[PDB]
Write a protein that binds this ligand. Structure first.
Ligand code: HEM
Ligand code: HEM
Ligand code: NA
Ligand code: NA
Lengths: 713, 713
């Protein structure tokens, strides 16, 4: 059946803004997962998981009689899709059970692991999400095998359809670099936002870069991908060595024996895949990655044997029974146990990427320190495992259950607890009046509050106005935030604040984070007044101000908007068209297409554009909240053409006289071009729609200002 | 960006069940279009349309100074996508403004027509939908030019995204038949459900079949395509001759001058397409179809000149300035006015498909009668134009405004007015008890009510239980409805009804249509009781019984279910996998994926299968409403394999003993295979889900029962 995407494959796709509707969700409108979780008997679930570990099923027998390694890999792959560039991927929505991730080659046989968990899922039902269960299971596996975990939080609500993620443009699974859709260019530069070296991999190729078994070159890819998953060298070394203290790989026979991945398998497979024709197809004859490596002498127990073996032998290049490159310890005895036959033993083996930890100079220093100080290795791994598995969960206020670690960690972008009375509605009215009497303009107040709040992204729940991080490095210096203008607004707000706080009793004070948002509200109210409407903008206090020392400057860099269509901003020239980037940003803001449309039209007339650009400012009453943007955009008396100087700026001229009326970008004009967007613009550009426009704007403005308010959730 | 559709292009697509969410809709959750339209000043809108007809815009000059012909073609293409096979297409959702229809080659320059209407759309706002306005504008055009229409109903609510319609498998616009994705096979048999001869056409090729200018062969394509749009020979002749009494075609220069369709055009085109480099690109130099024909001597006035010309001349094969085949009157004078230059006249011209009306013997008889009796022609066209433009509106209860015709038309599947008091809640309870005391079983009651209600399709709002047409020809004889079983059920219910109705006072009575539905409600209640649950199934009275004389048997044929997954039924062997046909039927029922899943699982265990098939009946407590289908489907202790006898039937065997536990079809097992459906099945197969399953089942059963109840809307 030929579809619109077949006819017009470069058209903008808005269905990404309308996923996760109440239509696809089997739970009721009122279902609140946090409340269900809070009543789960988590101790009972963990006992069930501990029993499961050694309860081997004949359709996928447990290696060494313990599924711990398999479930550790399962949880690490659940988390390990995360990219810091956009915050997409990660464990937080349980997307490993949906396409495409359930059929990625790197997730081979994790279908078996998740099926092993069905009876537990079934027993506890809606009280534990698949998303939480996958992580909990990894935790239990580590505990079962003697490793003390740092903690666990629940609260990952399940999702019900695949997330729309750009995973790359290749049309061949695991395509090596340099093809027609190469994710690499230049000196091995991986394109943003990708965080894996090949389509269908988690991070790197375990045989080495593009299958070449050079551990030093492998280390470069490990460092680059793990940095794109928010992990530094010490965390990387701790995670890889920690993970490969357990379990084994599976490569018993040639990969040609392995059949269709789950999404391609026949209906009788009932959701499973990779059925193998090699011998019994399972257990001792399992084929997963095609490598055949068992790292330690006790694969089902925490040990310090990984680094003993890594440093204690010299390594020789060999091949697995499937033909894959791997390494074997020279001159070693057969000390590694077999997973099924107690009469066989094996020599120590390693992956190329394991050897990276020794042959890369910076990793070697870490690896040695962990070898000599195994308590440091244990603590580093426990911490890094928690980070890995919770990195996308958002602020600590979302963490549920009795195992949440008390320690506050820098990467969580912590917010101080509020320990004073909040402002009330009378105080909010007094502060808004003070803000309006200071001389700050609608444009300044709007633009500052937009800049503070619009860092939020729903993919990993980082960012937003809570914390007043807009006054700190690096947000205060971002070009999209207009550093000089920002500094002058903040200085005026801080004087208002000081004056209001010095006048209070009983400990009441207002945070700068609250005041920035409140001042934006006053701006919107003033702009509505300028247009003749009486509008009160809702405001919820309770944000607190974070310190510079609570704000990791390097981790904040990924929030910098290099494209923000809502301020008609683009930091440079990109291969992705600006309207694509607009819809991307709207998705991260959690906006639907009607919300994105109203918001953008209102911001243009309020003076939110960076640099006070006139592009899209289709009104003669700037700083008044009207639907002018729509009404003028849709006026057929204007003809549009790209300028000779810049094909991405357009001039709109009177059709009869040729006189120039307006200029716009691609972000502006898409609303007059895309047939779905223009249908939305028509609703707000109609003669009956000025009130609806103002009210819908206020609603969406409020929504954006509250995106990170999980303290009130 | 590579997507799941690229990796697994044959996987079932569930996103079609989750369109039209509240996310994509810019109107409030409470917006009621009928209530907005009922307050529209329709006479004021018509006066504005009437003015527009002769107010030429210089960006698309009006032919002959009058846009009537353009807007008639616009409204006929809005309506003319309709197919009776599925009820999809038609004018009822305003889909011409979205992809792909806005960019079909047969809709070239209708973008200009829609844009001419923006000022009126903007003036009246939400009180008149684009969908209604398109039709209304066609009516006003006809009226302005002296033609008396049969009437107009409003009520077509606007939609906000493209509908998912199968329009054929061709990858090339207008591909001639016989390619790799040919819509034809055998002796020019057009595949169901298609109703056009080439991808991107409304009905037929105006040059003749695959471009071959033979009027006799073209007539075969006209008759076949129009029959597939519910029009017979008399309606067909009346529509084509009627339409081509007005306006002209546009073919002033070579087609290579015409640029990209709207979905492919540049952003600066602002939603318009087919920009032409031929001379001024518009008006006298317009190019649309490539043909250059003007049919009558008064293209802006109703007349009987189409037939005077058709029969009063002999015709010669010629070519337009773009090279298209067309016909010119031999020996004639220059009697046809030019559209822009009052000093030029032209000879009469016709399309090959116009000449079909003369050279096909059955059409010729009708055409002669219309030529000799033009009052019969005007009446037939009026009626056909109303039918065409309202065929997908549904029951008369949905028709709004002051111009609705009072005559009841057989194609409307009319339902008699109710003229007595309805049953109340106590009467409903007495009837339910009487039904259950008769000895009708849960299976019989459920199967009967499902059969009556599940003929509804949301595409054209035909079918449903209102009418009690299940007791009439042809429904009572459809094989899916189990004619002998059905007759015995109906006979018992009619005795119950007679007894109840003979006992009442004050005119109260119950219709058989209501009692069929009620009896199904008693069945579901009893099945819930059988399982330990006390529930009340909601029921709303007020259906009425239609007569055989009010039921067009031939038009009802297209409602027959040849595939009904909800009853595990497939009438024969098809190219489309059964699971695809299930999701197709769910879409026509207006069901989401969660609703589909609950409904199917419940119907299995209630005994709804045709023939009492045991396929998918995964329970040992048949006729009890439990979640057994899901619990047993998801049990990993059962292994599934296709049977040697039939690859589409599967045996489920105990994995350990090999004992046969169940059988199922592809429809059954898709819920254990497809990763999104199996995530839904898991929620209903969990241990905490039996109350949820009962409640959600009752809700979706009630939704189905009420699909055609637009009297209560
Ligand atoms: C450079 C990074 C890494 C690479 C290239 C990599 C590669 C792989 C490969 C190829 C397998 C074998 C799959 C099979 O054939 O069954 C595997 C197994 C596994 N990995 Fe990793 N790994 C990486 C990092 C991780 C990390 C960060 C963890 C966890 C903290 C982890 C834990 C595991 C465990 C537990 C197994 C054993 C599976 C079992 O016993 O069934 N690895 N690794
Ligand atoms: C066999 C069925 C039909 C065929 C092949 C057909 C073909 C076409 C073609 C090729 C054009 C010229 C488009 C252009 O170049 O501007 C057109 C114009 C038109 N058609 Fe049809 N037609 C059919 C039936 C209908 C029907 C059923 C109606 C309405 C009741 C309709 C009303 C018109 C009108 C009013 C125009 C003139 C548009 C203008 O003045 O701009 N036609 N037809
Ligand atoms: Na994420
Ligand atoms: Na339809």
């Amino acid at each position: 059946g030929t579809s619109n995407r077949d006819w017009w494959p470069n058209q903008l796709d808005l269905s990404i803004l309308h996923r996760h509707s109440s239509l696809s969700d089997p739970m009721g409108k009122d279902f609140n997962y946090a409340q269900a979780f809070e009543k789960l008997d988590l101790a009972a679930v963990k006992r069930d998981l501990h029993a499961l570990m050694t309860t081997s099923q004949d359709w996928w027998p447990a290696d060494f009689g313990h599924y711990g390694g398999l479930f550790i890999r399962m949880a690490w792959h659940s988390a390990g899709t995360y990219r810091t560039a956009d915050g997409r991927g990660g464990a937080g929505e349980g997307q490993q059970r949906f396409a495409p991730l359930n059929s990625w080659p790197d997730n081979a046989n994790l279908d078996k692991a998740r099926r092993l968990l069905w009876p537990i899922k079934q027993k506890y039902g809606r009280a534990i999400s698949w998303a939480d269960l996958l992580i909990l299971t990894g935790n239990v596996a580590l505990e079962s095998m003697g490793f003390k975990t740092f903690g666990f939080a629940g609260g990952r609500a399940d999702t019900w359809e695949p997330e729309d993620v750009y995973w790359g443009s290749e049309k061949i699974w695991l395509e090596l670099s340099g093809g027609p859709n190469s994710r690499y260019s230049g000196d091995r530069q991986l394109e943003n936002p990708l965080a894996a070296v090949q389509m269908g991999l988690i991070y790197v190729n375990p045989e080495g870069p593009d299958g070449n078994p050079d551990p030093v070159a492998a280390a470069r890819d490990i460092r680059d991908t793990f940095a794109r998953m928010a992990m530094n060298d010490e965390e990387t070394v701790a995670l890889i060595a920690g993970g490969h203290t357990f379990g084994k790989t599976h490569g018993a026979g040639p990969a040609s024996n392995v059949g269709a991945e789950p999404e391609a398998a026949g209906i009788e497979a009932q959701g499973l895949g990779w059925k193998s024709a090699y011998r019994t197809g399972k257990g001792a004859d399992a084929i997963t990655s095609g490598l055949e490596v068992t790292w330690t002498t006790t694969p089902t127990q925490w040990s310090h044997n990984f680094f003993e073996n890594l440093f204690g032998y010299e390594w020789e290049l060999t091949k697995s029974p499937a033909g894959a490159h791997q390494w074997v310890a020279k001159g070693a005895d057969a000390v590694i146990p077999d997973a099924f036959d107690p009469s066989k033993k094996h020599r120590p083996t390693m992956l190329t990427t394991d050897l990276s930890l020794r042959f890369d100079p910076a990793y070697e220093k870490i690896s040695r320190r962990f070898h000599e100080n195994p308590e440091q290795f244990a603590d580093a791994f426990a911490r890094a495992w928690f980070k890995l598995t919770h990195r996308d969960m958002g602020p600590r206020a979302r963490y549920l259950g009795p195992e949440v670690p008390a320690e506050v960690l820098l990467w969580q972008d912590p917010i101080p607890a509020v320990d004073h009375p909040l402002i009330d509605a009378a105080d909010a009215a007094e502060l808004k009046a003070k803000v309006l009497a200071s001389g700050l303009t609608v444009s300044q107040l709007v633009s500052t509050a937009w800049a503070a709040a619009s860092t939020f992204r729903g993919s990993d729940k980082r960012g937003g106005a809570n914390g007043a991080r807009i006054r700190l490095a690096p947000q205060k210096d971002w070009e999209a935030n207009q550093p000089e203008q920002l500094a002058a607004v903040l200085e005026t707000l801080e004087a208002i604040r000081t004056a209001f706080n010095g006048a209070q009793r009983g400990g009441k004070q207002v945070s700068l984070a609250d005041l920035i948002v409140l001042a934006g509200c006053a701006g919107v109210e003033q702009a509505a007044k300028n247009a003749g409407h009486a509008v009160t903008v809702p405001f919820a206090p309770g944000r607190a101000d974070a310190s510079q020392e609570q704000t990791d400057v390097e981790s904040m860099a990924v929030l910098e908007p290099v494209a923000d269509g809502f301020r008609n901003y683009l930091k440079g020239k990109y291969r992705v068209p600006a309207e694509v980037l607009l819809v991307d940003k709207a998705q991260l803001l959690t906006l639907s297409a009607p919300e994105m449309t109203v918001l953008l039209g209102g911001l243009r007339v309020l003076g939110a554009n960076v640099g006070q650009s006139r592009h899209g400012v289709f009104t003669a009453r700037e700083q008044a909240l009207t639907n002018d943007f729509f009404v003028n955009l849709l006026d057929m008396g204007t003809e549009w053409k790209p300028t000779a100087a810049d094909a991405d700026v357009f001039e709109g001229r009177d059709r009869a006289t040729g006189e120039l009326k307006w200029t716009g970008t691609r972000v502006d004009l898409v609303f007059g071009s895309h047939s779905q967007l223009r249908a939305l613009a028509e609703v707000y550009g109609s003669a009956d729609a000025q009130e609806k426009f103002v009210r819908d704007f206020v609603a969406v403005w409020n929504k954006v200002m509250n995106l990170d308010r999980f303290d009130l959730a």
